[PDB]
Amino acid sequence: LPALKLALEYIVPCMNKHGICVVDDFLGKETGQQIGDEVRALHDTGKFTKITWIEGKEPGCETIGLLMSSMDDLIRHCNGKLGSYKINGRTKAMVACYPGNGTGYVRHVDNPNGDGRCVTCIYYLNKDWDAKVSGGILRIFPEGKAQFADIEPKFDRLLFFWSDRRNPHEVQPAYATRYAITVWYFDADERARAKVKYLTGEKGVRVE
Numbered sequence: 272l273p274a275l276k277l278a279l280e281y282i283v284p285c286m287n288k289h290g291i292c293v294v295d296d297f298l299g300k301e302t303g304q305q306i307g308d309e310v311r312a313l314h315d316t317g318k319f320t321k322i323t324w325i326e327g328k329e330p331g332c333e334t335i336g337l338l339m340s341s342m343d344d345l346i347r348h349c350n351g352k353l354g355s356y357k358i359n360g361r362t363k364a365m366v367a368c369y370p371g372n373g374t375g376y377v378r379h380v381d382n383p384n385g386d387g388r389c390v391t392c393i394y395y396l397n398k399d400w401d402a403k404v405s406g407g408i409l410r411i412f413p414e415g416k417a418q419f420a421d422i423e424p425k426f427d428r429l430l431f432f433w434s435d436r437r438n439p440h441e442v443q444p445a446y447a448t449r450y451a452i453t454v455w456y457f458d459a460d461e462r463a464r465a466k467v468k469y470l471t472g473e474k475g476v477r478v479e
């Protein structure tokens with residue numbers, strides 16, 4: 272369970288070099304399947320509008336909370352070494368469902384205009400996923416780098432990449448149901464001025 276070694280000796284150098292880092296078998300089969308059940312259960316609450324946002328404290332979402340906690344640990348152990356960013360917080364977890372009728376997601380930059388988000392963190396929970404059959408590959412186009420990077424939404428896979436213009440990415444069509452959980456980490460300075468100019472933050476919330 273050497274998270275400090277994983278962070279300093281793998282995640283950090285990997286991100287500084289490529290701006291993309293893949294960590295396989297993050298939480299183990301049992302934990303990953305637990306997350307799968309929690310995520311599929313979100314449907315029966317009618318939470319999906321498909322995406323839903325999870326804080327982690329919700330009843331029936333505590334394994335998701337475990338994942339988020341683990342994610343936070345790795346980031347905490349990195350602190351100060353991921354670029355010149357200073358991570359002071361994150362978003363809630365966004366749970367995405369691609370129904371699997373050829374539905375993907377068009378090429379886009381997560382944070383093109385500086386809303387504070389510096390690192391994207393994705394966990395995939397698709398048990399026995401085969402991208403040969405079911406597709407759903409995430410293709411990232413790292414800025415200036417040669418070829419693109421194809422990343423299978425493999426079960427229990429954790430992915431990190433820069434959120435800014437350096438990593439335009441698209442999700443290729445899914446031919447089976449494809450779930451992912453995403454958290455975005457905030458850089459202190461970028462986030463500070465983002466609250467100044469954008470309708471983001473607590474003030475960004477609608478009241479009845």
Ligand SMILES: Cc1nc(CCc2ccc(F)cc2)c(O)c(C(=O)NCC(=O)O)n1
Nearest residue numbers: 322365367376379381393409424440442451
């Ligand atoms: C469903 C989904 N939505 C967004 C952005 C939506 C958004 C817009 C504004 C916001 F403020 C917050 C979120 C993504 O970027 C990805 C993605 O990149 N998936 C990669 C993957 O699953 O492999 N998927």
Ligand SMILES: [F-]
Nearest residue numbers: 471472473474
């Ligand atoms: F806030």
Ligand SMILES: [Fe+2]
Nearest residue numbers: 379380381440
């Ligand atoms: Fe994205």
